[PDB]
Symmetry: C4
Subunit: 31 residues, 4 copies
Amino acid sequence: RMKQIEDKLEEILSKLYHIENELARTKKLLG
Amino acid sequence: RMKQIEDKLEEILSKLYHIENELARTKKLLG
Amino acid sequence: RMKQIEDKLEEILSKLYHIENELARTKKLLG
Amino acid sequence: RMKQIEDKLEEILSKLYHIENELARTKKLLG
């Protein structure tokens, strides 16, 4: 199923945004 | 081929969970 | 739906290039 | 095409390994 693929894509993308949000912080803790 | 795409999907997910965790020890050690 | 899957693919790729670059300034600033 | 999807998956995965390799370093620069 293609919808299944898309869906796992959506979740894959989610994780990258969260990963982007923990770099923002790590960047900040290091001023 | 879907069993493939499907495998690589979870493989992709599994490494984003590892990367998320790697970044999560850095950011605490940093704290 | 393929145009979707295909979009989200490049969207996924584009953020991994950003994350790679974020991590790349950290690691030099660190140096 | 499914093969196209797979292929972008392969490259997506590539980037995550490289991303794993620049955390290894950033981790090390911070002892």
